[model samples]
Target chain A: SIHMEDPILTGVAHDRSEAKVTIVGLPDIPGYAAKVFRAVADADVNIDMVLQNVSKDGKTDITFTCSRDVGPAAVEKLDSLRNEIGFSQLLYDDHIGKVSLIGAGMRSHPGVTATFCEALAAVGVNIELISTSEIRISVLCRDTELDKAVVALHEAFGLEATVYA
Target chain B: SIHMEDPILTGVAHDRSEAKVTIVGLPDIPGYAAKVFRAVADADVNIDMVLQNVSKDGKTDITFTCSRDVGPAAVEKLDSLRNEIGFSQLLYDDHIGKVSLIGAGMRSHPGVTATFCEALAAVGVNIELISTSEIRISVLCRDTELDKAVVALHEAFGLEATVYA
Candidate 1:
């Protein structure tokens, strides 16, 4: 059975100050993804992270992350003609978390990867999804796990010790 | 006090097989809405409906709707740096509602508009937001009212009788 968990927000800032966008009641189809991208492309906008779901009844919910500056215009354009696009409703918010890890040699450090996973596992926190870059490894965990995961990772990676207080 | 209702998904298609994406941990903010759009714009993606909440502790939550094609890539990007963006977490679910209203002359008709509001209001449903266009009036109503809103709008507009049938 699939359980729908609450959305979480975490990131590098001292507080939860990140921006976010949500698109609900969308058609869940193959090319439908293309339609959304097309709109963004025409607007000359740049998106960072994106997430979409499968359709339950020919519809789905999708969300993405981007810079805080252009968030409103994007909502206005998308919400304007929601009916023609076959969407039911529209909503927006900017307060979220973007919890992430930064390493200069993440690609070459398997221990870093193992340590990151182990720390979260030790706390009984679930890793929802994962993505990686040359120097970064990111996981989507519960909002409640924000501090736990961050502290765990910091200890595992020696970040706390490395910092000069 | 503003009471925000949760969106409920109801409906079934002929086929039981489907894919889904659910986003978790979205923050609440004013322009944060644009942040997600900027990311999608950067990736040149299209989006559908959006559902978001107002922030309580200087943070809020949000979700988006998009096609299935962009699901994986979007999630990858979001999951990779959950910390940097400050979203608590992310989930993917595609089986959701995309219900909405459409008409060529909606903005100009008073009775049509009255019917639309009266139906949902009579059912004790609250409208979240409304986006207007020359030919359409898109609304963000609760998912529970998905069917009711569609049927109510269709009836109010005299489009439900099926003249040909």
Candidate 2:
């Protein structure tokens, strides 16, 4: 037996225990990303939300999040890799929280993201970073605003409980 | 019914028809990534492999791929968004290919990526860009080298056909 859901949006979720790090100004060349991640993996720190935008002036930035507890270890490993990796600087912040929307039906639902963004924007929430997969869409914001964001998303997705029958 | 495979890697795949575009030097602020993708969605272009790395001097880059045939239209829409989005430039390349490894078993397997990268390196194939999901890892390379990269991966994964009774 199997159960099916009605709407494409299944639920809203949040994470407040993750910290953000940026390996700034890495050379925009081949194999650099693999090298950076290799270093992180070697340190045994699991990463989430890895974001690398675009390169300018022949360099780029790499930002990802990991558990707040492992932030220092990740930074330390990356610091030791600076000379070899040729990245200019490192940034770490533990004041951010992540909010996500999860559902398996999003692939066929074109307007789901627009609805999500519009809800956040209507509440004046600022999305600092974003990542998406076929079943998930996540964004980073100030940790202090995490509760408000979760509440807003819950209301937007009609997740509030109501009596039936 | 259930089926299980021994090795984490199941298959190697490639896509040669997607084109890449980079929206360079956008102001590093909240809501910018959302806005850029909003414009792309408004154009009805489906994006794959969206990447935005790190910011330097208060700016960042956003790159993604789409069907090659829609590359021009995506660029046209993004070009019109330039002033409003405050990005410095747009770069488009249709001469690229993506090769990927897919296996639902990769979560418990470390070093799979290392083997993948080493195989490419052994053959002198350079990885231009990278993206990953829990079950997949993909790299962008020169279109001309797609076959070589795929073949190398096949060998690395021991995918060559061998008959047994």
Candidate 3:
């Protein structure tokens, strides 16, 4: 019974302690995402979310996100591979955070997604990126908007602080 | 000028050949995911969407999805580490394929999440797991359901079969 879940997951969680790095413009070739992530893995850093750009003109950008504690190690480790991996440059932004509204039985109901974003947009918070799973919806926003986003989502979804309402 | 977009990013990509591997119940020690991924990377295998379970009792499972075209070498490499690492067992599945419905401007509109899953569910297809990013939604289903899911999605989304038709 310990593993049994009620399945309707909804809530607001704020994460202000993460770092993001972008390996800018690698050729549309094999082994780039692998090589970049391998270097991060060799450093023993746990990465959280990865969002990549569509290739434009045979070159693409790969953006990686990780917890603040370990993300730096991976970023510092990968920055050394600018020319080695066909990336012309790299960018790092630490003034960022995420607000996730997760629902276990909610993937079947996408209206949560619309309300989630509109709640944020209503407050002038621009979502930087979005990542999702079966029951989880996570978005990246500025650190300043972390708390605002959380509260907005909680109200939007009528969820308790820790669980879905 | 940093964020400019042309919204023609509709593609119906089918990844029919990938292998799945799971390293079960490793201790809640540091760098575990990294260690596992590092091993895979060292073998020069390009990995795809990874799903990790919520940790239980200081232990967790890390499930990796990688292309079969290059994943076998990494899987073989990691199998030898069962005793070396804290994990005691591993599992592999090969009869899986993934179809991703991707749109560059889509992450901003996450309603796609609901409609995609609903479209499949309406056709009696169950989604085993889900991984999402800014521009793509990748889901794993039975090889048998892959074609049906794609067709359902194409029709449901009112997009082109070749490229989001």
lDDT of each: 0.46, 0.72, 0.63
**What TM-score does candidate 2 get on C-alpha atoms?**
0.80
Tens-digit lDDT track of model 3 for A66-124: 77777667667877666667787677778887788765544423234445656876676
TM-score, B chain alone, candidates in order: 0.53, 0.89, 0.84
Which regions in candidate 3 have their CA more than 4 angstroms from the true location? A1-7, A160-165, B1-165
Ordered by TM-score, highest first, the candidates read 2, 3, 1
Error of 1 at B30 (Å): 26
Ranking by DockQ: 2, 3, 1
B57: Cα error in model 1, Å: 15
Q: Candidate 1 on B11-120: residue-level lDDT in tens?
A: 11111122233344444422233344445444554444443332223554444445667766666665665665567656665443334444332322323333445565
Whole-model lDDT, candidate 1? Answer: 0.46
- Model 1, runs deviating above 4 Å: A1-17, A103-135, A139-149, A160-165, B1-165
TM-score of chain A of each: 0.60, 0.88, 0.85
Output the better candidate (2/3) by DockQ: 2
Model 3 per-residue lDDT tens digits across residues B17-119: 8877777777644445545756775565655565553333377566666677666676678886766657866777787778888765444232345456567
Clashes of each: 105, 6, 6
> What DockQ does each prediction reach against the true complex?
0.02, 0.28, 0.03
Which portions of model 2 miss their true places by more than 4 Å? A1-7, A105-110, A157-165, B1-8, B105-110, B157-165
